[PDB]
Design a protein around this nucleic acid. Structure first.
Lengths: 274, 276
DNA sequence: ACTGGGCTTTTCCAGTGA
DNA sequence: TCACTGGAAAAGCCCAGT
């Protein structure tokens, strides 16, 4: 058979899943190369075939076995929690720009899973015995199921392909880490400089400030009481890899979730002598 | 006779509990209750001393004082109101287990219907004036005292209303509090940037208020400088004297402009400035 | 057993501004 | 004109401690 390739994966972090109460459509999963000058979207290329067909996109769990996910895909040409539309006969590349993730409430879990089985939404045909186990409601994968045609018009189900995982920004343990503001970004190599850091919502047991620089790994000092309402950290800076120096040296300041080694975008911190 | 509230309830700082949270309803304390001496909402009946009954219900904060969708819960409470006998020997009566159980928005109509169905409307507001927007974060207590006349007949005295009782989860009405500040001194010329961590505020209804002898000045910040309602980044105002010879102590505090409410003050020291 | 406070889960809303 | 977007508010949950 021909095959399906993901030319632009979905963006992993930053987007929050939206409940059904917040509207009909849930925005659009952005392409991972989406600038802001540019607005890219998840795209697939169909190799070895060009012509009519069908493309279905559904949500499966992040980890194998990739059971159907309780959450729903909503937006253009979405029904029963999955996307399904005619493949464009003229084009071999296909953009999906209206895919929103609608999260199911925890008290509607077993019913949502029932609808997956009822609608034959099971791209990897996992037995129902294993649709019993726990679901990570903060992470999904896109599953592209493309049906093409043989030379006589016989449906040809191409192998389903899984995207990178998409994480819910609603959950602070899966959200994007962002440093919004600091009272200063310079200090002495002796350390002890008090820093007030403003950040996106974090969890005080699963957070730390990560100073790095070639071959040196330091860590801001604070306690869980020094995290104010999940969105601010008051910590003391660590010493530089040299209580000496003379030169103004620049290093990296990052938030870190130890549970998954996830880093915020780096902020620059300038260690100064004396 | 007439009814007189001689200790109002405590306004701010007590949390309404949903029926889903178990009960956990609590007890409204007196307006001047302390940890050294606990006080409770207390009324005084003037012109009568004898047998009688009292009903306490919830009414809206604003006129018309319709019955509130919330419920009073606790001992001797039923159908959202309190009712029991008064003391037949004195004219001063306290109530010690009054708790406010809040109804959710989707259960609003069911609650108002129960108020009507139970004849819980002390000001007999017509059902026309009874579908407005309700403030689910503010209630008033309504005391309805029934008294005997010299004949022996129930005499319902006019209902008296308490001051508003607020949910502390509403930020427009909660107590203002400074938790952490990165700087308690700065140049008398102003302009020092300061990070302030506070309890939840509203970025459109908050100020940083510097006070002194006939002196008031405000920190400079925009709404974008308020981070998730719990952090303010502002720059200091200049002091009244741009040529200080010695540090001067002023008080710094949060302030809510819409209701003139202020947080606890905090010591800030303006310093002499050298050369800019 | 019964409250006091933080957080999570779910819902609501205002404006923005290409 | 409008899904969308991000901030905020409301509803529910959970733990600790007495």
């Amino acid at each position: 058979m021909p095959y399906v390739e993901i030319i632009e994966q979905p963006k992993q972090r930053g987007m929050r899943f939206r409940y059904k109460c917040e509207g009909r459509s849930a925005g659009s999963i952005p392409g991972e190369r989406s600038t802001d000058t540019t607005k890219t979207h998840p795209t697939i290329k169909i190799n070895g075939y060009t012509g009519p067909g069908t493309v279905r996109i559904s949500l499966v769990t992040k980890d194998p076995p990739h059971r159907p996910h309780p959450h729903e895909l909503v937006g253009k040409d979405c029904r029963d929690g999955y996307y399904e539309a005619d493949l464009c006969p003229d084009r071999s590349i296909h953009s999906f720009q209206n895919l929103g993730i609608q999260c199911v409430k925890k008290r509607d879990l077993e019913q949502a899973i029932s609808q997956r089985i009822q609608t034959n939404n099971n791209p990897f045909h996992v037995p129902i015995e294993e649709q019993r186990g726990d679901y990570d409601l903060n992470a999904v994968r896109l599953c592209f199921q493309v049906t093409v045609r043989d030379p006589a018009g016989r449906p040809l189900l191409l192998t389903p392909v899984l995207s990178h995982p998409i994480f819910d920004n609603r959950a602070p343990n899966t959200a994007e880490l962002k440093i919004c503001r600091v009272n200063r970004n310079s200090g002495s190599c002796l350390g002890g400089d008090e820093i007030f850091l403003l950040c996106d919502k974090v969890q005080k047991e699963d957070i730390e400030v990560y100073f790095t620089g070639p071959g040196w790994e330091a860590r801001g000092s604070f306690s869980q009481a020094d995290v104010h309402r999940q969105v601010a950290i008051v910590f003391r800076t660590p010493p530089y890899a040299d209580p000496s120096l003379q030169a103004p040296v620049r290093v990296s300041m990052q938030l870190r979730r130890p549970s998954d080694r996830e880093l915020s975008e780096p902020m620059e911190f300038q260690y100064l002598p004396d």
